[PDB]
Amino acid sequence: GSIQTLNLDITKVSYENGAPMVTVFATNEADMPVIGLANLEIKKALQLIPEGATGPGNSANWQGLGSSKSYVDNKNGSYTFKFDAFDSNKVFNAQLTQRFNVVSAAGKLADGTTVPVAEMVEDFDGQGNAPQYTKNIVSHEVCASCHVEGEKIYHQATEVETCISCHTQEFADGRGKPHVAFSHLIHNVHNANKAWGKDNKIPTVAQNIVQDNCQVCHVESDMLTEAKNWSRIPTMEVCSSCHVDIDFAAGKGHSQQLDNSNCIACHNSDWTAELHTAKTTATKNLINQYGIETTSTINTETKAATISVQVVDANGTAVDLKTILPKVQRLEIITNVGPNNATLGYSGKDSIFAIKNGALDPKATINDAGKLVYTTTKDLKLGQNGADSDTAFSFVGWSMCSSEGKFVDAADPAFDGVDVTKYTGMKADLAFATLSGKAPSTRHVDSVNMTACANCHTAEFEIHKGKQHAGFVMTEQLSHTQDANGKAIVGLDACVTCHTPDGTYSFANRGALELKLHKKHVEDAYGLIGGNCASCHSDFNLESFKKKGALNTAAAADKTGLYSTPITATCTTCHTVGSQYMVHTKETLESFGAVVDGTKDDATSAAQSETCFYCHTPTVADHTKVK
Ligand code: HEC
Ligand code: HEC
Ligand code: HEC
Ligand code: HEC
Ligand code: HEC
Ligand code: HEC
Ligand code: HEC
Ligand code: HEC
Ligand code: HEC
Ligand code: HEC
Ligand SMILES: [Ca+2]
Ligand SMILES: [Ca+2]
Ligand SMILES: [Ca+2]
Ligand SMILES: [Ca+2]
Ligand SMILES: [Ca+2]
């Protein structure tokens, strides 16, 4: 027995006896009644003090009426709560909106059926009818973009409405701690201007992901009638959460404000909304002004790839590159071979900055058709490593010079790209060519795609933007397949040009794409992801292992490469051999056909000898499934 989803509805609220009687109906993912819940509770009963009631400019706030774990299982999927101690403070007002926060703890029914956590709020008028007014600003779904759905976020609960129901203005006032009001706390813990908690945690990582972008949590919605409160209700209590150096009482860093009466008179919604979103809006506008369309052909006699880049405008119309060359900050072309098992390594790949700060490299030209044209100089070794090695794949990244939301001419040929306020990474592209002239091989893209990355990093993520790279914006420009609904898949297959089976610049960094995303995110995003493979994966492509060879897993004492068989290499990124995270010894892994941190030749020869998937049957839902 296992329930996948527990749905909760408050179906009836009756005040016929004084204190409300509250009926909850519980169903599973199949809409069948759930009988026997043992940990159902009204975690909070509240009523809504309306906006301005506590003073001009002040927020609406949730006033406490108690809680209850007292209920009858009616044996039909419904549960009826009573309150032993309703409204201890004697503030109940039937003219106010009434809220109930209902939670069901993860656990087991009696029959042993597993039941997942469930939370909800529902609002009512003072007689249990539909409510007359609400404070509906955000919904739990925005938090699930970045925090694993169904797991506690910091503590107590899994859904933002539960946090909001306890972290009230009344709660903060009662503790003498303004900062624990949820509308203060939530900005505080994602903003690095001040630390939080006894430990003085500086939110460096939250700051680097969220970047004060109001629109990752504040989203307009017919379902959320107070969604525009983020710009319409300026208060010292909320604005000070990130604006930490103003003292409104003393008039330091701002004119004196003794209350919230005048904030909106000067801080109009249009200005607050515009000023906090201006820069991301302007950047997104610049990224969407141009595209590129890239082709690649192999000379059958020289075995060199020629890559052609067509700039296009927002409508897909040709732009001659000569017209915008002075504004191009960088354009880079990286070519590798064998899209399912890259063969040239990091050191052997072909790479060029065809354009730097408005100057063509002498190896790149613009033809009479207005296309940039570049021919590889490295030995591509086409056809030297089986059918996959027939195919060259070329990744194009580029950037435009930009200031205050406009493209500008490059004024400084030596501009180093460190100052990311001076340029915009643009839409990257991927082009395939074959030596044989047959259709190209392509890597699988059916297990991970850029939609998952964009949940935390946004669709405008300028990957590697800085001193070393233009910034790769990943879009349908480099899609070559569709999912089962016909949606273009934006794969990470182009990243393999550098993230090769031989690693990146050093044999020490687990640079292969099969290892690198796991290594970065298990080290730096475990608070968000932990073991949640679904944060990136729709599926595992286990069949892809049959196209892999050796994967670089370590550097020897002399700085040369050590390699593992590909399943062992992939699992060991998070399961280090000889650590507390890996039960299998090296000897045991070798008994299962593996090479652990051996020579490229030994790992290549053994790459299809691993018996791991005889026992292991990983799925995204449970990657641990085995024996
Ligand atoms: C991605 C853009 C995010 C969205 C949307 C939300 N949160 Fe977040 N949060 C995020 C990061 C990158 C971090 C820092 C993690 C780290 O490792 O340092 C956080 C941090 C928090 C915290 C602090 C405690 C913690 O879990 O580390 C809280 C309490 C928190 N976040 C809550 C939260 C809620 C309730 C959200 C929806 C309104 C929410 N976050 C959105 C990234 C993102
Ligand atoms: C009451 C039933 C709570 C619910 C639901 C949530 N939290 Fe909470 N939180 C609670 C208490 C009693 C405290 C200590 C307050 C104090 O006096 O210091 C907290 C504290 C936090 C903090 C630390 C805030 C700070 O020190 O600046 C965070 C980041 C926090 N709580 C987050 C949080 C989130 C995201 C919740 C919903 C998932 C949540 N809390 C619910 C009580 C209650
Ligand atoms: C998620 C990590 C958020 C980001 C980023 C920002 N805000 Fe936010 N805000 C968030 C929550 C969960 C809440 C509480 C909502 C509730 O129902 O209590 C808020 C609240 C505000 C408010 C208060 C509105 C009111 O009625 O008093 C304001 C003025 C506000 N938020 C503004 C704001 C701005 C300007 C941001 C970008 C700079 C922004 N928020 C980011 C969650 C998150
Ligand atoms: C963190 C999530 C923030 C909250 C909450 C609020 N603001 Fe903010 N504000 C923030 C940043 C990162 C910036 C710089 C933005 C940029 O692109 O330049 C700002 C800026 C302002 C400004 C302009 C700067 C100035 O010196 O006055 C104003 C007037 C401003 N912010 C007002 C404001 C108000 C009224 C808020 C509560 C509704 C508020 N901010 C919240 C980050 C955050
Ligand atoms: C008009 C007479 C104002 C009243 C009343 C309030 N504020 Fe203000 N504020 C005003 C100006 C002209 C500026 C500078 C704008 C700029 O872009 O330079 C501000 C600034 C702020 C900021 C930003 C602080 C910073 O980034 O340095 C915040 C967060 C802010 N103001 C909030 C705020 C609140 C909450 C008010 C009522 C208590 C309030 N301001 C009153 C103009 C006026
Ligand atoms: C939220 C749950 C995330 C998902 C999904 C993905 N990434 Fe991520 N990434 C996340 C965090 C919290 C951090 C560390 C930030 C810090 O400041 O330390 C990262 C880091 C990266 C980096 C490093 C560069 C950077 O901008 O910090 C890269 C290049 C990166 N992440 C890429 C990436 C890709 C391609 C993803 C889809 C496979 C991806 N991330 C998912 C949080 C999250
Ligand atoms: C060669 C021009 C590269 C391309 C194309 C991509 N990456 Fe990269 N990446 C590269 C180097 C030299 C390094 C540092 C050494 C190392 O292997 O760690 C990286 C690093 C990453 C990281 C780790 C964190 C960081 O340093 O930013 C991640 C998560 C990463 N790279 C992801 C990534 C993705 C998703 C790419 C396709 C969009 C991608 N890289 C392309 C070199 C190059
Ligand atoms: C985003 C930060 C990721 C998380 C979280 C996890 N995986 Fe992953 N995985 C990721 C990428 C970018 C790739 C490379 C795809 C490529 O083209 O090489 C992978 C690859 C795997 C593979 C190889 C098979 C495949 O589908 O490509 C396996 C078996 C795999 N990942 C397993 C896995 C497990 C078990 C996770 C949860 C603990 C997990 N991944 C998280 C990115 C991310
Ligand atoms: C990082 C992105 C991971 C990759 C890649 C893989 N695993 Fe994993 N695994 C990971 C975590 C964070 C955990 C939970 C650890 C804890 O105790 O909380 C696990 C757990 C397992 C387990 C269960 C633990 C045990 O002692 O056996 C198994 C069997 C397991 N993982 C197997 C496994 C295999 C076969 C992988 C390659 C296909 C693999 N994991 C990759 C994180 C990550
Ligand atoms: C059956 C005889 C097995 C073969 C063949 C392989 N593994 Fe295994 N593995 C097995 C069991 C019974 C367990 C523990 C399961 C549990 O829940 O406790 C494991 C565990 C792992 C783990 C998790 C390690 C940890 O977290 O400590 C990993 C990463 C793992 N196994 C990988 C792995 C690889 C790469 C194999 C082929 C070389 C392999 N296993 C073979 C059972 C069996
Ligand atoms: Ca209802
Ligand atoms: Ca819910
Ligand atoms: Ca802070
Ligand atoms: Ca293309
Ligand atoms: Ca075999």
Numbering used by the authors: 44 to 670
Sentences from the paper on this structure:
The central mechanism for electron transfer across the membrane involves the Mtr complex, a porin-cytochrome complex that consists of periplasmic decaheme MtrA, a large transmembrane pore MtrB, and the decaheme cytochrome MtrC on the surface of the cell. MtrC is composed of four domains: an N-terminal β-barrel domain (domain I) is followed by a pentaheme domain (domain II), a second β-barrel domain (domain III), and a C-terminal pentaheme domain (domain IV).
The overall structure was almost identical to the wild-type structure with a root mean square displacement (RMSD) of 0.297 Å. The area around Cys453 was largely conserved, although Fo-Fc maps revealed a negative patch of density where the disulfide was formed between Cys453 and Cys444 in MtrCsol. This confirmed that Cys453 was replaced with alanine and the disulfide was missing, but there were no other significant changes in the environment near residue 453. In addition, there was no electron density consistent with the covalent attachment of anything to Cys444. For MtrCsol, the presence of FMN doubled the amount of peroxide formed, while for MtrCC453Asol, there was a greater than 5-fold increase in the amount of peroxide formed, with a peroxide/electron efficiency of ~1%. The fluorescence spectrum of the isolated complexes revealed copurification of FMN with MtrCC453Asol but not MtrCsol, consistent with the reduced forms of FMN and MtrC heme facilitating an increase in the affinity of FMN for MtrCC453Asol. Normalized spatial discrepancy (NSD) values between the MtrC model and the molecular envelopes were 1.17 (MtrCC453Asol) and 1.28 (MtrCsol), suggesting that, while neither solution model fitted the structure perfectly, MtrCC453Asol in solution more closely resembles the crystal structure than MtrCsol. In our MtrCC453A isoform, the formation of the disulfide bond is prevented, trapping MtrCC453A into a state that favors FMN reduction under aerobic conditions, leading to increased production of peroxide and cell damage.
